[PDB]
Symmetry: C3
Subunit: 490 residues, 3 copies
């Protein structure tokens, strides 16, 4: 007796978690949170982005007007979703630079189409085919006009359409490649010649090529699809003597945040900002390992499947006389992160220190605020999966994406290691500061026992201990008693 003990300490928990810092590959802390999103619901939420499910139609089929795609006429989207099951069911066609037409329409985000009255004097309009049935009748692409001879004549077409609007017009047109010379004459009444579609700023000349291709839906012929954008004040000129699959008008072309994604995920009635081909994913976390293909406010794609951010201090078991923080945590300290234990004339007691606890918690919450719920939006990007071998351009698309992902993965690894080191440092610092504050209060009335405790060399009852904890302890009151006890001969 005639003395008291005051220990400074911090909490510990029975179920700590392992994180990485700059100092340690593995260090156990009291708590952590995951920064890599690794699951999806598996459905694409239909809100808040405007989703257009292609069903059996690709975007290009919906553009040309395949009859199974008639329900898509004039629709808009933020995200057009193309399904793996999609198939063409009209005249067999190809699109030189298909990927680019798909991209530009996808990014435009609209199928709005305005009919125009082209002057097709001297030919038959509206050719149809049993390969393109609409309501069980022979038909054709809705937005295209198959012109054939009239009374066994096909006079040279030289047809104009000015753009007197204040917006751009996108024209889609085609060239028919007949299977045989017999079809050429049957359809156009004369041998094939070139088609030239021009503006003041552009020209495209295409040669029809007669010949059998392998039959697709029993058709050995083909249509090749082309496009032309016409600016305000410019003029579309179409020049042909046959084989022309004419436009019926133009598509509006807009700019904004629209895109296209390949996915078989079902569309759900729900709300989620981030879309991936695997489904929508929560965007609370800064990183994700679900898919490199994303649309909307999304976490950044990284290679790691987990990155744990420390949200508490180092977790240190209790050693099995009271003792302080030196190689020792306090599992029984449940109402604070830091505090005091004492032994005096009135017993052994514990109290949490609110200031130090709140200081650590505030700083941790600060870094959570920077990292959680702070994702940025991206929209139309580049393609990142490919169904065909292409060489140079695809090599570059792949390398650009690989490069980006490795750089982000590195940033994520370093960021978490740095933040975790800072959390360990700031929580260690709050303990050290509390110890030093207490040391300073006690002046010459106590000695440091080396275990995170002070031996107070005077009687220090519950109110006295509370005065130390509260910062109102007056060392002068006890100094005579303390010095006598400290510097006595034994």
């Amino acid at each position: 007796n005639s003395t008291a003990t005051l220990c400074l300490g911090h909490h510990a928990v029975p179920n700590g978690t392992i994180v990485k810092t700059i100092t340690n590959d593995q260090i156990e802390v009291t708590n952590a949170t995951e920064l890599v999103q690794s699951s999806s619901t598996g459905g694409i939420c239909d809100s808040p982005h405007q989703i257009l499910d292609g069903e059996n139609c690709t975007l290009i089929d919906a553009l040309l007007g395949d009859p199974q795609c008639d329900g898509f006429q004039n629709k808009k989207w933020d995200l057009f979703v193309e399904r793996s099951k999609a198939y063409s069911n009209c005249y067999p066609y190809d699109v030189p630079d298909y990927a680019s037409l798909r991209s530009l329409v996808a990014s435009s985000g609209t199928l709005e189409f305005n009919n125009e009255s082209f002057n097709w004097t001297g030919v038959t309009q509206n050719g149809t085919s049993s390969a393109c049935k609409r309501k069980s009748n022979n038909s054709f692409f809705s937005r295209l006009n198959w012109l054939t001879h009239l009374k066994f004549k096909y006079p040279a077409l030289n047809v104009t359409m000015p753009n007197n609007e204040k917006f751009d017009k996108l024209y889609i047109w085609g060239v028919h490649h007949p299977g045989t010379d017999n079809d050429q004459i049957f359809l156009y009444a004369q041998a094939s010649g070139r088609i030239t579609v021009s503006t003041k700023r552009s020209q495209q000349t295409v040669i029809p090529n007669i010949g059998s291709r392998p039959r697709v839906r029993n058709i050995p012929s083909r249509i090749s699809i082309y496009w032309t954008i016409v600016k305000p004040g410019d003029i579309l000129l179409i020049n042909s003597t046959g084989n022309l699959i004419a436009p019926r008008g133009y598509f509006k072309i807009r700019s904004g945040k629209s895109s296209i994604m390949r996915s078989d995920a079902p569309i759900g009635k729900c709300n989620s900002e981030c879309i991936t081909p695997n489904g929508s994913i929560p965007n609370d976390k800064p990183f994700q390992n679900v898919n490199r293909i994303t649309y909307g406010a999304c976490p950044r794609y990284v290679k790691q499947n987990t990155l744990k951010l420390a949200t508490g201090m180092r977790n240190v078991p209790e050693k099995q006389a009271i003792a302080g923080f030196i190689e020792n945590g306090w599992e029984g300290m449940v109402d604070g992160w830091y505090g005091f234990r004492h032994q005096n004339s009135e017993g052994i007691g514990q109290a949490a220190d609110l200031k130090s606890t709140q200081a650590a918690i505030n700083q941790i919450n600060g870094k959570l605020n920077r990292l959680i719920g702070k994702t940025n939006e991206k929209f139309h990007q580049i393609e990142k999966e490919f169904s065909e071998v292409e060489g140079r351009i695809q090599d570059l698309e792949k390398y650009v994406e690989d490069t980006k992902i490795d750089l982000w993965s590195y940033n994520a690894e370093l960021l978490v290691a740095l933040e975790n080191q800072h959390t360990i440092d700031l929580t260690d610092s709050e303990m050290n500061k509390l110890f030093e504050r207490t040391k300073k209060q006690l002046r010459e009335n106590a000695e440091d026992m080396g275990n995170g405790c002070f031996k107070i060399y005077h009687k220090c009852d519950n109110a006295c201990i509370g005065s130390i904890r509260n910062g109102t302890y007056d060392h002068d009151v006890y100094r005579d008693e303390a010095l006598n006890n400290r510097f006595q001969i034994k």
Copy 2:
């Protein structure tokens, strides 16, 4: 009396600035400096890079030799500046892969042209047009030679030009697409056929296509422009029966640091290393938010419009008995960053500590030296703005640039937060070190009062205090007096 007080402290200023660190989203420091350049003069400085202002000419117009561009013949540049007002005023033309020819000429940095004597036996040379007037006379592109029939014959051309130089030759040539069959015969005396331009390593065959395009400067015909590079030891071969717009010789093609930029900024008589389309910008700062398009030694483009680097310590107001640094700065400390305040028999005094002040200043100046005036040069890059919709290739160019900017923006954000944390840490450290040095000098002659001051338990006049400040205080001299005062019963 019989004692003195010695406080350690640091300065504070009335007008501090807010910065970000790893610990704090907002912390006030005594001073900071801006690391993002956000303004431009608005003019492109004509020094130290060689500027060529295109005025009404695009580079390609200057290459072909549009008469309004005659003043550009043979000129070189570091940066060719194309103006939005530029317009063609010669025969209407297009360039398949215009962007590439523009790029390669821009990067080459020269319009040097060497005439060669091609053997055009049997045709008429130097065709002209009222669509391409030079000094009010019908004329044509200076570097091109419009060949037409001679005496209603156009014999098959098969013309050679060896490269016996030790450098590459760039040839620019064309194909004339006449508006009508009548023009074809009037000009070339026979029906159109293909043109083949070849070397030992390459071949290009082009088909003239007769037909009306929309009139441009009253001309429904077109010229399509092509290019061929011929290596030393190789041979250009030109094979044609009409429609050939022949080269008059070759352009030198060089390699170096030349580029091209679209800008309407006026050119000024001034000197600046970094050029953007908005004008030249100072390059003292490591980052800039003026334009992603740059030429020369330029700060790196980031999305942030401000990033403040701390250049002083935490700014802490004075609490309103002398007191030291514990939650308290000294606004009256104007000749140093750190120092001493004392109270003794002779009054209350202040003195700056030079060593600690210079230590902080030196470290801050060190990081300024790494960050300020250290930009790196870039020259010809990729295009970053586009006037036409193109799809795939443009999608990739845009994504590469977006990717780069987001990565640099992240680096900039982290760098400044890390540096600012280090500045706060190093300035706090200098204060702590000064306090600890002083504590060690004083030995058993003083006690820590907890407010950044020592109670010195002996008479310590001005010279004595100075001895402490100077590091020459001899604790043994005063220890008997001090111990008697410290360990007295009161």
Copy 3:
């Protein structure tokens, strides 16, 4: 006498090395290690990757079956090495999009070829040329079949080959462009017409173009090479009336980690994971400045030619009474990094502290483990050197690579500065912790002399000093003696 001195200290070495930290551009440490690989042996090791040395053959020559490349038939590779000396020695040819065919074959990693029996009824097969000698006889590309007229007839070919396999087939074919009309008739018995090669999903039509090109190996004609990939369930259709250089079958096309590299480095009998055009390089270091072109588990390319990672503490010379660590290292401390020096009744002694030494060494070894021998593999990428001027696509390839390298170079610079600062901090910390532990043990029996030493105010013989070093010193045993000595009047 009646007292002892105990100093805490750390080692120093006579040959320290300069590194960079966040605090200091240059600080000398006791040791460092290089993180940038800057040399190569100069040979490409033939293990563990499967190397195929092209010798005089490009990959495309080996594909087509140039007779000097016959030894390559059906071979596979991880890395195909093309030599600058390589040359074609068969019929002169070109490949529109050569770079892409080269890339896709390179990435596929196999020349496996399966013959098929095409129905060439009505034509002569196996045309040969003195321009393509095999064992001194006129011959031709092994994988191609030069068809010519039979009995002065060349009937219209319309030939099919179904893919009934479960893998893709790559077909290589060509179009012959004869030098003259005489050759056209001599070979094909009629005027030239188009060739169409099609599948259910693709069509390619090519026009033979008659004309002299500059002679290559005395041949003014040319063959243009094309390719077609045919999926399971699809069908190749070949439609021609002449000028067809027919396939003899197909190449397997595989996917995996194969690539191609341009290098003149000799191939050696050795084992190395990382290949560059300069030769194989060790992959222990995380970065390298040898070549941006790499294959395998390679350090990342950076611009720096050296980055030194500190592997020891700050190196501080000995000041020329024992003294501790304050501005002073101990060159004579050779069995530990940290330790104790003492002066007592029995002499002056030194002992290393094992715990502190091992703590620093362990942490440094930890960071070495993260950085050394941890490279990641990359395989087929993009090309990074170019022999011809191309404009837009090449501009983008170059910019993507420059962008990547600058970002990695920045990461490397920051990483090393951060790690070195952490090493300085952790080694300084071990010294400070040892001093503080000792202070705590000594309680009221010693005073801090300010030079990293304690004055112990009692007789403290060798065993006593050892008790302090061992952590078993009992301050209570000596406290009466120590207090009497400390607080005596002199």
